Design a protein that fits this description.
This protein has 78 residues and is of the alpha+beta class. The chain has 3 helices and 3 strands. The structure holds one DNA strand of 85 nucleotides. This is Histone H1.1.
Length: 78
DNA sequence: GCGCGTACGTGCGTTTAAGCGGTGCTAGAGCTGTCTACGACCAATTGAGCGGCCTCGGCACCGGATTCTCAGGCCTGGCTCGCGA
């Protein structure tokens, strides 16, 4: 499972009203068997790529350190 | 600046021993007298140490290598990014 796929799965899995933060996504990936320490840069890059592609809409914070949600709209505007 | 989680504040019923009081004791602080050992004072003597002079080598310095560390470029290895089936 690619980093972005696990990120999307965890984000759709969590039911936070305000979104899933960097710490929350790290905890989810760590619970998913992912090394959150050795691959931190990759997690951040995947998050940024998902934000840029419009897959994840950032709700709080700026950059990688904020919180993000699934965009249920861009999934059908391909 | 943000997120987490755990460790500290707040309150309540239970227990526990501090504090007050009283009493009794007797150990030791405190004062007093005797006198004896001990240190101040003072003269005489001499040798210990202070001052100057001399030397010579421990060390400061410089030249010269030898090994160490910091830094960095290049290669190998795997994992990711991405597009289609």
């Amino acid at each position: 499972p690619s980093v972005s796929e696990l990120i999307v799965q965890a984000a759709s899995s969590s039911k936070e009203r305000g979104g899933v933060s960097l710490a929350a996504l790290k905890k989810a990936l760590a619970a998913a068997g992912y090394d959150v320490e050795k691959n931190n840069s990759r997690i951040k890059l995947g998050i940024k790529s998902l934000v840029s592609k419009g897959t994840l809409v950032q709700t709080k914070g700026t950059g990688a350190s904020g919180s993000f949600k699934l965009n249920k709209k861009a999934s059908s505007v391909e």
